[PDB]
Design an enzyme around this catalytic site. Structure first.
Site, PDB file in Angstrom:
ATOM      1  N   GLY A 100      58.395  40.642  35.169  1.00  0.00           N
ATOM      2  CA  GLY A 100      60.006  41.142  35.900  1.00  0.00           C
ATOM      3  C   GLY A 100      60.312  42.440  36.570  1.00  0.00           C
ATOM      4  O   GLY A 100      59.355  43.509  36.554  1.00  0.00           O
TER       5      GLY A 100
ATOM      6  N   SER B  41      53.072  40.209  32.320  1.00  0.00           N
ATOM      7  CA  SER B  41      53.491  41.056  33.031  1.00  0.00           C
ATOM      8  C   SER B  41      54.708  42.261  31.850  1.00  0.00           C
ATOM      9  O   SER B  41      54.405  41.454  30.581  1.00  0.00           O
ATOM     10  CB  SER B  41      53.741  41.369  34.368  1.00  0.00           C
ATOM     11  OG  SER B  41      55.024  40.713  34.787  1.00  0.00           O
ATOM     12  N   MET B  42      55.832  42.273  31.916  1.00  0.00           N
ATOM     13  CA  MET B  42      56.576  42.688  31.121  1.00  0.00           C
ATOM     14  C   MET B  42      57.029  41.750  30.395  1.00  0.00           C
ATOM     15  O   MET B  42      57.431  42.062  29.220  1.00  0.00           O
ATOM     16  CB  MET B  42      58.315  42.946  32.148  1.00  0.00           C
ATOM     17  CG  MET B  42      58.181  44.412  32.897  1.00  0.00           C
ATOM     18  SD  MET B  42      56.883  45.325  32.276  1.00  0.00           S
ATOM     19  CE  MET B  42      58.549  46.496  31.289  1.00  0.00           C
TER      20      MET B  42
ATOM     21  N   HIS C 148      48.684  42.637  32.727  1.00  0.00           N
ATOM     22  CA  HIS C 148      48.463  42.898  34.412  1.00  0.00           C
ATOM     23  C   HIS C 148      49.974  42.911  34.720  1.00  0.00           C
ATOM     24  O   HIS C 148      50.801  41.923  34.678  1.00  0.00           O
ATOM     25  CB  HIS C 148      47.453  42.836  34.625  1.00  0.00           C
ATOM     26  CG  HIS C 148      46.988  42.601  36.084  1.00  0.00           C
ATOM     27  ND1 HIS C 148      47.206  44.355  36.116  1.00  0.00           N
ATOM     28  CD2 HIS C 148      47.995  41.797  37.082  1.00  0.00           C
ATOM     29  CE1 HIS C 148      46.845  44.204  38.168  1.00  0.00           C
ATOM     30  NE2 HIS C 148      47.325  42.522  38.551  1.00  0.00           N
TER      31      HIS C 148
ATOM     32  N   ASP D 173      43.516  41.188  36.659  1.00  0.00           N
ATOM     33  CA  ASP D 173      44.267  40.294  37.011  1.00  0.00           C
ATOM     34  C   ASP D 173      43.923  38.874  36.348  1.00  0.00           C
ATOM     35  O   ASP D 173      43.015  37.894  37.024  1.00  0.00           O
ATOM     36  CB  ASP D 173      44.052  40.443  38.582  1.00  0.00           C
ATOM     37  CG  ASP D 173      45.443  39.562  38.714  1.00  0.00           C
ATOM     38  OD1 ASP D 173      45.826  38.443  38.187  1.00  0.00           O
ATOM     39  OD2 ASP D 173      45.645  39.005  40.791  1.00  0.00           O
TER      40      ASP D 173
END
Lengths: 173, 174, 170, 175, 171, 172, 169
Positions: free
Chosen positions: E58, E87-88, E112, E151
């Site tokens: 996010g 991610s986060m 990533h 990715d």
């Protein structure tokens, strides 16, 4: 949204004081509520006055005529109050209060004009009923009402009192 | 969600228990009915104790503000009007309509009496002559001053508004 | 939904914690001002804690909150959580001297990114310069210069600039 | 925003204690469902006390209105029916379906028997022929008279609707 | 609808000191997570807290707000990856207590950051992520920099070998 | 909007063992009806259940989920057609207990299924409908398959003669 | 809207978890919470999962699946109406001998069709391993059976090993 008072929301404590608010446009939902509140307040007593506070631009004629007829049907006296404005069908509900008990605050704007899917003949039949209501409650002649309703304007409360929409303008603070 | 405090109230109902009315955001028929209902209720709780009226609004519908104004004048109680953030157009009328000596602003507020921006010209002019008349009675100014001041599309500081007579006290101190 | 324990935020408000989160507007400001005035009545001398995670918002809404912070007598702790940008960093700097805190990874921006006349926007802007000048004790020129740069600064740099007193190293 | 009355009831539940059913606004399956449930409940509380139906509606779905109509005819209670504002199309059928002698209108109500205008043509005509028989049963007119009256796109006055046989009383005030 | 068991199911879990960080992270989620973390510390500073992570990640500054609260409070935090932590979401996973970061066999991990403010400001934030991952992963910044531009998703066994996790449940 | 009547009007009806299947059938409706059916079986396996149908139909697999619950539970089910029962709504009517399927006089019955997945999968699912109707109506598959081809409604007195329902409650 | 406990809180008290409609991260969150709660009430009494689902997000379904396999309770899975895509994996992941369907349910193991193609492929290879493990089919059968875009009857789904029982009631 609605604050709580001591518990009730404010509008239902106003209803407990026998105050009905007609605010904003009139439609079949607003009428349904106003009809229900009038029928309820009659069942709680048929002798204590009811107070109706009008601030509306008017609305659907058939909804306004439903409220009107119920005000005439119920046995209670009805005080009626204009705040801010009562225009078109809103001023019919104002005019339809009990004689002597129709009030306005000094800066209210009153409009008797009826601002401009159905056949032409049926809109005219509704308007012919409006002329008879205004003539009944204002005690003007039909010829005066027809020409007064042609002017697209608002009356001041003092003009509306001499026209016979109001009995009192309460200037006393 | 509105936070509940302590019986348990949302804070806007607790503030109403302190006789504080909040006029926040634009004024419309919904706000007008809420403000009038709040004011009429507070009169029933007592005719004598002041009412506190916190104004942060960009103004709004003229006939909606006049409905609030007319209720403020009908009620017998002193009304303390507090400008916070801004009071523009109809919002500065409500500020000005507090009782003499009880109209206050915080020091970073902006006051505007000009009326910025469906009705015939004759009725807007009739409404506007009412504003000229009622500003003159509340500010103790001449109509020519009101007419001139309402023509400039500008805000004024609370020190200027106190000199113009929109305010009584500017609380620069804590 | 938010979890029940009270709702989670009403439980925090009983600890005298006011959460300013998200963008500031008249609806947020009225909530914050209402909470600030209540908490003064509940005790006139215990501190209030303001937690700030905000990108800023309407200037008159932020100035309405700020004026209330200066009116009430209580100390106010301001905590920068995540970010405090534009009007959010003014509320952060408006906390009581010695009681302005940031977590180590917060990003602070005093620049003002991006219905009203130009002369009225500039008059508001000049008010912000006077607020930052009195609270940071910087010169007006440094405030004008630092508010012109469209950037964030770290908490250690914001402490050197005078927006903060403490950074809560892990 | 619906007022509360003090146990505490909303205004419509408070009226339901008076045996009042509000058929307001357009009729559809959820309106029909809600009216039928209320009628069956009110019959349980008393199979012989009258029920009061207040009607202000432009009509609606025909099969949803016929569901309401069939419920009015099933229950043993007398049903007093009131028109306020208007009763058009299917709203006039619910008006006419009240108990003989207990169908009332206020003086300014607008009554329309005509049906203003997803299924094949044969099913609309089959619905129509049911309506003609229902109106003939309750108004006591002949089918051809109903067919001629139901073709004109117009509203009756309350007094004209009484002469047609849709109403029994027009009331200015309670007698 | 949320079932009632009286509490709704998520408040019943909060009494077990379980915080569900599920769905995308944003400024509003951060407010809820931080308030729940501070409450659980008030009830006790000693007993562990359980973080259940199921998120695509996010807003970066919202996730950093949660991360800084995890490091401020004194409690051990067990972090559980459920389904995915991308991610986060994977920063909150890695920021669990050493030895108390767990995953289920089929969880997908991605450090990533897939895909407004100035370019120079994104790069300063980005360099903070390298320092955070390097601290908790016990790895060179050069390895983080290389891994964080691929990715791809790691399996739980690859994520354990990288140092994002300590334990994988076996069933 | 829903009036309250200790209930809302629908939970008061559920306490009388009345289940309402109203408006279109979908996965949400199927889940709610199946939950109510399983509840009422626990309150007793012997007292009848009353199911009121006013439905245009809906998702076929959602209606089959309701159907399978009606056939699983031990209770007798009274099924009432009120207003309309079309498409899948007419299968729930037909699937009431024999001797306990009813209609009001002005109901509309339709067996036709008014016109995603592969073409072959709709016909596979359609072929199950022929079997279900043939079991409950006691018509042959050819009679069911022919009747289902006409895009028409029919009156209660014809669905009674067709065997879709047992009783028409003529008005007194 | 929902009859009255509410009907689902009453059902949860019978240890019934409803999985109805499509599966997404919010549905997974709510189902996992209920599963973990029911284990806390006792690690011995069976749990009933009712599935009527098109399926949905794969990683949300895999999160549910790992929760069903983690907790020690027996889980009885019921196919109601249809179980498609990820819905058929949750069905197959019931306890051996306790996976049930109603007679007219439709079952589909095909996976109908934001991330790279290579990453979707890594997810699909996990699906093959799960189905082979739980159905006791070989991987080559599962890989072929997912390629055919078709439904199967409960009787055919039992021969495939997705079901153990068909309730002739």
């Amino acid at each position: 949204l609605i604050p709580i008072v001591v518990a009730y929301d404010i509008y239902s404590r106003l209803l407990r004081e026998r105050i009905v608010c007609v605010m904003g446009p009139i439609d079949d939902s607003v009428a349904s509520l106003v009809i229900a509140q009038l029928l309820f307040l009659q069942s709680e007593s048929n002798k204590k006055p009811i107070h109706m506070y009008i601030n509306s631009p008017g609305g659907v004629v058939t909804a306004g005529l439903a409220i009107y007829d119920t005000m005439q049907y119920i046995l209670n006296p009805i005080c009626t109050w204009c705040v801010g404005q009562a225009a078109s069908m809103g001023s019919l509900l104002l005019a339809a209060g009990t004689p002597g008990m129709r009030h306005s605050l000094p800066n209210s704007r009153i409009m008797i004009h009826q601002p401009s899917a159905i056949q032409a003949e049926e809109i005219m039949k509704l308007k012919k009923q409006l002329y008879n209501i205004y003539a009944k409650h204002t005690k003007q002649s039909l010829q005066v009402i027809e020409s007064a309703m042609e002017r697209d304007r608002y009356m001041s409360p003092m003009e509306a009192q001499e026209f016979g929409i109001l009995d009192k303008v309460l200037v006393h603070p």
